[PDB]
Amino acid sequence: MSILTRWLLIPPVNARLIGRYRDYRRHGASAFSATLGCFWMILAWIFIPLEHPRWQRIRAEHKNLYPHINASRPRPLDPVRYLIQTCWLLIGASAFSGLQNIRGRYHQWMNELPERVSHKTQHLDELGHLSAGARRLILGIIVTFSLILALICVTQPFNPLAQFIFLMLLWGVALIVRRMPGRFSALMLIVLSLTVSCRYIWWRYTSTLNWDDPVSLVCGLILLFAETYAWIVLVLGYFQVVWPLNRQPVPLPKDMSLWPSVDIFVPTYNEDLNVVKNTIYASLGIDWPKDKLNIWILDDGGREEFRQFAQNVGVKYIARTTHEHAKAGNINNALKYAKGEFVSIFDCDHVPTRSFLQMTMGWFLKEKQLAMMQTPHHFFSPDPFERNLGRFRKTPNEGTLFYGLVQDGNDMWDATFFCGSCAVIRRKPLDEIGGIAVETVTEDAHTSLRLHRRGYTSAYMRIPQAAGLATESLSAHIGQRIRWARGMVQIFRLDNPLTGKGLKFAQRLCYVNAMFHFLSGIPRLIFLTAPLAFLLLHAYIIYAPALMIALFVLPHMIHASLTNSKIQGKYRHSFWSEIYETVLAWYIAPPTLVALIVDWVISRPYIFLVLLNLVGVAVGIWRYFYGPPTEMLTVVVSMVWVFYNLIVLGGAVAVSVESKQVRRSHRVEMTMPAAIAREDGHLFSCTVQDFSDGGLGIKINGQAQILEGQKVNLLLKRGQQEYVFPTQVARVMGNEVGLKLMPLTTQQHIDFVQCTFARADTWALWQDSYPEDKPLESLLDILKLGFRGYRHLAEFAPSSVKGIFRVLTSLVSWVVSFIPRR
Amino acid sequence: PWFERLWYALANHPILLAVLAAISVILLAWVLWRLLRIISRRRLN
Amino acid sequence: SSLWQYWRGLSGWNFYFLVKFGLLWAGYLNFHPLLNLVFAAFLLMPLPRYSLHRLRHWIALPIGFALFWHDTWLPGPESIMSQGSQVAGFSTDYLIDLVTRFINWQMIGAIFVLLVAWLFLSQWIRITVFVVAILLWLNVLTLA
Amino acid sequence: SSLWQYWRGLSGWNFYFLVKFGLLWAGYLNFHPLLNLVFAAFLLMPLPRYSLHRLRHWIALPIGFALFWHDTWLPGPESIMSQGSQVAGFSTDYLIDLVTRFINWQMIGAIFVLLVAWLFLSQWIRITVFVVAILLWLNVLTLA
Amino acid sequence: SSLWQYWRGLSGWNFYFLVKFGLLWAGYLNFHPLLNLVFAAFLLMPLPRYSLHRLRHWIALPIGFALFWHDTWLPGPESIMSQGSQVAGFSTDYLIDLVTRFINWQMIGAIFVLLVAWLFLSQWIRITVFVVAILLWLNVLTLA
Ligand SMILES: Nc1nc2c(ncn2[C@@H]2O[C@@H]3COP(=O)(O)O[C@H]4[C@@H](O)[C@H](n5cnc6c(=O)[nH]c(N)nc65)O[C@@H]4COP(=O)(O)O[C@H]3[C@H]2O)c(=O)[nH]1
Ligand SMILES: Nc1nc2c(ncn2[C@@H]2O[C@@H]3COP(=O)(O)O[C@H]4[C@@H](O)[C@H](n5cnc6c(=O)[nH]c(N)nc65)O[C@@H]4COP(=O)(O)O[C@H]3[C@H]2O)c(=O)[nH]1
């Protein structure tokens, strides 16, 4: 090869070229690849002035501007990638300080405008201060006027241009009022989304139902009923979380003589002691007088270890010989012996906090008919949607939305249902209702409903005061969700909340809306396979031009997403609720349907659906050229729909990657102050990154001098007390130091759990660290989630489809290699 | 046909309809705010 | 300089040229491609100091105003200067009627939505490249 | 050894060649491809010293000006020297009016826009290469 | 013993051979493939002695001039020998006018352009290989 170049090139330039070629080949390039790369390099130097300082700077930053182009490894079709990226760079947009300051001032003024308006309306309060009859008549007539204007806004026929302009204006309204703190803006957006969704549903029901074929009519009805169900559920959910009460804890009487006695039940059937230990150690730290508290341990295993543990930590143990009605039966048996005015069921894993029994017990003495006060559930361990997807402390848990906003909203209508554990029930009403519900599997909601039907109210507190171990497998999380679904279904089949006496209609609405999520499998399946009615069969489900569909359906989705992102802000990232639903919407559906009338089990339906949608996308690619130029945008819309379904299914597959887990103790990554002291009199600070049940983690600033066999005394400071416990250096790998906690006696464990786990301040800063809900941030993240799921399935699928998924994933990666990046 | 009469009075009128919709949205949000605040006070106390 | 980082872009004048494009599309314009292109070149000319950049924008404002006036179908300054006294002496009702007939609410709505869309696009996509490409396309079509 | 830096391009005369190519494309110029490629060969042919390079450009400035003048259809300056007395005998106001009438502002606008275009496109397109390519093509056309 | 280090190519005579090629295309020369190929072979001989290299330069320069002259259709030495007395008395202006008429400035422009082209191409592509190959092709064609 060198001889030909030397015959063509002078030894200086020949040496330069040979060096460049060898540099290309050293990085794993082929002969053909490096040859074509050299040809492209020489052409580029011919045309583009790489010696110009602009191009010196551009080459210097070649990594950032061209993340998908590896300079050291040339590849075939590199000029196509370069052209695409450079065209985007010219297209893309790259004294900005003054403009940023002006924009920030504008944002601050918009945010504070409701504040100033509220101050003006409050100091000049003077809204209901007129005469009763005139006030009622005025409210009625004004409501009728508003409803008439809404009706004319909903049903008005519009042509493409008019519809587009209306959409844009109302979206601008939604965007402007979205950045408006308070609780009034939520009502504004709820009303606006209700009007827009009524407009869309009316359009679908009055202009776009195809009556020309007995084949495109039944399918259209199915899709329209799916959308009607979705709209009904959205409206009931809006009613559910319309105005969270933000209930405030009541300070208890200063004297400690009128306070009641609290009985704490910790039920256990098969859990090991290694999880109950921390809960009972933090329970002993509860800031309550020790003569008016009873912490109980109940063991369905008949185990002696819990007996010994309870005896040596100073709490009570009771076990039963006969196990009937599972948790309900065990808790009732415990209540039979609980000589206390209150019963507070704590889970076998949710660690109580010291300021629990006083931050939730004032209302039981203020409101004299209260019967249940539930407390939020916060999971410190990664749930199966966090560990498998690498989404720990980056995406909130499934229950974050519920326990942060939905039950606070339910508190307004008095429908906050017992959530399994972590709640206080006054025993006087509990004796009247017969105890814990034993019929169904969801004892909690049934017991709460039975309490509510007797007139006794219920409460809720927002502060996270209970941390527990999240689900450790996707199968077990599916089992938990399916148990909730089956229990609610059994409740409805046995006791309909809608038909009763003594309940406000709002309570019935909250109860039924809590049971519209467990029938939401059929609509999900219908939506997923809906585009397989025009691409596979030939049926116009929505008898309308493709621009009109994109102009009526689109406002509904955009306004619903915007409103929900505003109301459920730092609780549920967008498009993840869909992923959770479709993960559930194959196994919760069969039980409810029966009631109405990789993995060979977990992820078979995902494989079925991805195969069907891939057949659909292939046939759609067929129809794009064979189809008439009129019926062209319909294929484009249906292909976008199938692509969305494919992203959904890829995410569903991705969630099912059960990763390696050998950490015996789940690590809670929080920053707390600690210190280390050696046998010299000098104290060294340390930066603590995380702790666990039997360990810790500290990064010493400087790493002065320690070894793997030296003894270091660890000093833990809380408030104004310093605590000393023996620690052993476990890992020494530079700035990261490993520690292992030896087994201890009772008091040492109480002090340690109070110093690390049961701190009622860490979860607040944790919630402060939650990333804001951002649609665009979700986009690439969810796309990568789907791609990872597809790749994993391609790895662990049957061979006959392993090849198919392999070639498909290869094509996807090859195409994404060309797509520009910022 | 009166409904068609009003429609034709606003078939090419999406902007006035949008503004009237905004006005009704504000009014309905206001009445809902009143009722919800009253219910909230009647519940909490 | 080495790289001349004085090609900052048209910045605000993107709306100016987009409004001119819209008014030419509607059919109300006697568009002048050469003068529009020279105005774009004057707006995009690189200048070292920021003071001269600000002065260039300030001097371009009245010239841009005059160019936009010249590109419309409205009468020239001679008629305005000759009929200002008559307009002042006219009754208020005639002036109000003329003002009402002058303003088209559809035009105002289109211009406002164009401004909002320009705000969004400038927040996302660089507009100067598109504006100059359209100006070059118009000039090439006209001269050919 | 930075010997390449003796072959830099005709950056600074790329505007010269682009203006002349445009003027030819509008038909206002009497073109000689051989002479133009001779001038391009002069420009791209190095000199041993940067001082010698500056001297080359100082010598080429009269040469470039003369080539631009003679390439245009203007009469020879010897006639101007001979008839300067007759021109001075004519009225000066008429001469001023005539020279104000002669200047075409459309070509001046095109020249200004081309200057801005060159000063921006000297990054993504090298202009000495393209100038010499078009010059070679025109020479080939005038040879065959 | 490193004889291969002295194979630097035809070097300075590449311009001479390309000049002859350009003339032959222009037809102002009667080419002698035998004599010129003999000159090429004479230059081909590698000699390690640099003083002998200077001597071979001093021998080739008259040889090169003689070959270039004799390859011209110009009148032979007999005619100038006979008419030197008459020609020497005439003014050099007539001689230079006749030279310019016989050899036009097109040839000198091509020579300047080809000098620039050869100088720049003798920093990227081995010119001697191609020049020798084309000389061999010319000799082969003239043989048949
Ligand atoms: N032998 C040992 N090394 C320890 C221990 N604690 C910390 N390290 C070291 O510190 C790193 C901790 O990574 P991370 O931030 O938890 O982030 C981790 C974590 O997200 C995940 N990961 C790796 N191994 C495990 C594991 O065994 N269990 C779990 N749950 N995640 C793991 O991958 C990331 C990279 O971890 P590594 O590459 O292993 O790098 C590990 C490892 O080198 C320990 O108890 N034993
Ligand atoms: N926070 C923290 N704790 C530390 C660290 N080093 C040691 N420990 C504590 O000491 C125990 C023993 O870990 P090991 O001897 O490294 O033996 C480890 C190691 O072989 C492996 N392992 C656990 N986590 C990781 C990990 O992230 N990366 C790797 N590479 N191995 C891990 O599993 C064994 C059991 O570890 P664990 O169950 O976590 O239980 C750990 C943990 O409680 C450290 O850097 N950070």
Check whether residue A618 and residue A737 sit in a common domain. no
For residue A106, count other CB atoms closer than 10 A to its CB: 10
Does ligand 2 lie within 6 Å of residue A667's CB atom? yes
Does ligand 2 lie within 6 Å of residue A730's CB atom? yes
Q: Residue A716: left if φ>0, alpha if ψ -120 to 50, beta else—which one?
A: beta
Measured from the alpha carbon of residue A659, the closest ligand is 1
**A663 CA to centre of ligand 2 in angstroms:** 6
The answer to whether position A806 is within a domain reads: yes
**Cβ contact (<8 Å) for A91 and C125?**
yes
Residues with CB under 6 A from ligand 1: A 660-663, 731, 736
Task: Report the C-alpha gap between A399 and A405 in whole angstroms.
Answer: 10
Choose, out of A55, A61, A91, A99, the residue to mutate when testing the contact with C (most C CBs < 10 Å).
A91
User: Chains contacting E with at least 3 CB pairs below 8 Å?
Assistant: A, D
Check whether residue A465 and residue A523 sit in a common domain. no
Amino acid at residue number A584? L
Q: Is A98 exposed, middle or buried (0-12, 13-18, 19+ CB in 10 A)?
A: exposed
Q: Are strands A466-468 and A378-379 parallel, antiparallel or unpaired?
A: parallel
The answer to whether position A481 is within a domain reads: no
**A666 CA to centre of ligand 1 in angstroms:** 12
Mutate to test the pocket of ligand 2, among A278, A392, A661, A663 (most ligand atoms within 8 A of CB): A663
- Paired tokens of A134: 């005139």
Host H or E run for residue A705: none
3-class secondary structure, D35: helix
What dihedral do alpha carbons A319, A324, A327, A328 form, nearest 10°? -110
Q: Is residue C44 less than 8 Å (CB to CB) from chain D?
A: yes
In chain E the first and final C-alpha atoms are separated, in Å, by 40
Task: Report the C-alpha gap between E129 and A476 in whole angstroms.
Answer: 78
Task: Report the C-alpha gap between A539 and A532 in whole angstroms.
Answer: 9
- Residue range(s) defining the domain that contains residue A810: 603-655+778-822
Task: Please say whether the beta carbons of A190 and A178 come within 8 A.
Answer: no
**Cβ contact (<8 Å) for E123 and A7?**
no
Which of A402, A288, A421, A280 is closest to A351 using CA atoms? A280
From the list C2, C113, C124, the residue facing A53 with the nearest CB is: C2
Host H or E run for residue B10: helix B2-10
Tell which residues of chain D come right before a gap with C–N over 2.5 A: none
Amino acid at residue number D116? V
**Cβ contact (<8 Å) for C3 and A91?**
no
The answer to whether position A663 is within a domain reads: no
Helix axes A78-91, A799-818, angle to 10 degrees: 50
Please state the length of chain C: 144
Tokens 């969004």 sit on residue: C120
- Paired tokens of A454: 């007797």
Check whether residue A567 and residue A679 sit in a common domain. no
Task: Please say whether the beta carbons of A796 and A598 come within 8 A.
Answer: yes
Give Cβ neighbours of residue A680 (< 8 Å, ≥ 6 apart).
none
Task: Report the C-alpha gap between E135 and E41 in whole angstroms.
Answer: 11
The answer to whether position A390 is within a domain reads: yes
Chain A nearest-CA residue for C126: A93
Task: Report the C-alpha gap between A404 and A471 in whole angstroms.
Answer: 19
Task: Write the DSSP assignment of E1-39 as a string of letters.
Answer: --GGGG---STTHHHHHHHHHHHHHHT-B---HHHHHHH
**Cβ contact (<8 Å) for C50 and A165?**
no
Which residue has the CA at smallest separation from atom 10 of ligand 1?
A: A736
For residue E129, count other CB atoms closer than 10 A to its CB: 14
Task: Report the C-alpha gap between E15 and A286 in whole angstroms.
Answer: 100
D27 to chain A, closest Cα gap in Å = 29
The answer to whether position A491 is within a domain reads: no
Domain residue ranges of chain B, discontinuous segments joined by +? 2-44
Amino acid at residue number A56? Q
A38 to chain D, closest Cα gap in Å = 20
- Paired tokens of C90: 């006219």
Task: Please say whether the beta carbons of A789 and A653 come within 8 A.
Answer: yes
Residue-wise burial string across B3-30, b where 16 or more C-beta atoms lie within 10 A, e elsewhere = eeeebeebeeebbebbebbbebbbbbbb
Beta bridge partners of residue A732, listed in sequence order: A737
Helix axes A474-494, A589-596, angle to 10 degrees: 20
Does ligand 2 lie within 6 Å of residue A740's CB atom? yes
Amino acid at residue number D58? W
Check whether residue A304 and residue A380 sit in a common domain. yes
Alpha-helical segments (H) within A292-396:
304-313, 326-337, 363-366
Task: Report the C-alpha gap between D66 and A703 in whole angstroms.
Answer: 77
**Cβ contact (<8 Å) for A7 and E129?**
yes
Task: Report the C-alpha gap between A249 and B18 in whole angstroms.
Answer: 43
3-class secondary structure, A504: coil
Check whether residue A795 and residue A715 sit in a common domain. no
3-class secondary structure, A510: helix
3-class secondary structure, A551: helix
The answer to whether position A664 is within a domain reads: no
A543 vs A86, A228, A271, A633, A645, CA distance in Å?
Answer: 42, 17, 57, 13, 22
Task: Please say whether the beta carbons of A59 and A38 come within 8 A.
Answer: no
Check whether residue A785 and residue A708 sit in a common domain. no
Which residue has the CA at smallest separation from atom 23 of ligand 2?
A: A663
Give Cβ neighbours of residue E94 (< 8 Å, ≥ 6 apart).
none
Chain E residues within an 8 Å CB radius of A6:
126
What dihedral do alpha carbons A163, A166, A172, A174 form, nearest 10°? -90
Q: Identify the sign of the CA torsion A63, A65, A67, A69.
A: negative
Q: Is residue A67 less than 8 Å (CB to CB) from chain C?
A: no
Task: Report the C-alpha gap between A44 and A27 in whole angstroms.
Answer: 21
3-class secondary structure, D11: coil
Check whether residue A338 and residue A468 sit in a common domain. yes
Check whether residue A321 and residue A420 sit in a common domain. yes
Check whether residue A723 and residue A752 sit in a common domain. yes
Check whether residue A309 and residue A403 sit in a common domain. yes
**A662 CA to centre of ligand 1 in angstroms:** 9
Measured from the alpha carbon of residue A737, the closest ligand is 2
Task: Report the C-alpha gap between A442 and A491 in whole angstroms.
Answer: 8
Mutate to test the pocket of ligand 1, among A393, A659, A660 (most ligand atoms within 8 A of CB): A660
- Paired tokens of D106: 């459309």
What are residue A668's phi and psi, to 5 degrees?
-95, 105
Does ligand 2 lie within 6 Å of residue A688's CB atom? no
What are residue D33's phi and psi, to 5 degrees?
-60, -35
Which of A344, A373, A466, A401 is closest to A762 using CA atoms? A466
Amino acid at residue number A108? Q
Tokens 């507070």 sit on residue: A344
Does ligand 2 lie within 6 Å of residue A694's CB atom? yes
Task: Report the C-alpha gap between D101 and A659 in whole angstroms.
Answer: 84
Q: Is residue A15 less than 8 Å (CB to CB) from chain E?
A: no
SS (H, E, C) chain C: CCCCCCCCCCCCHHHHHHHHHHHHHHCCECCCHHHHHHHHHHHHCCCCCHHHHHHHHHHHHHHHHHHHHHHECCCCHHHHHHHHHHHHHCCHHHHHHHHHHHCCHHHHHHHHHHHHHHHHHHHHECCHHHHHHHHHHHHHHHHC
Resolution (angstroms) equals 3.6
- Paired tokens of D108: 């001046």
**Cβ contact (<8 Å) for A7 and E125?**
no
The answer to whether position A793 is within a domain reads: yes
**Cβ contact (<8 Å) for A48 and D126?**
yes
A220 vs A210, A477, A529, A623, CA distance in Å?
Answer: 7, 35, 13, 21
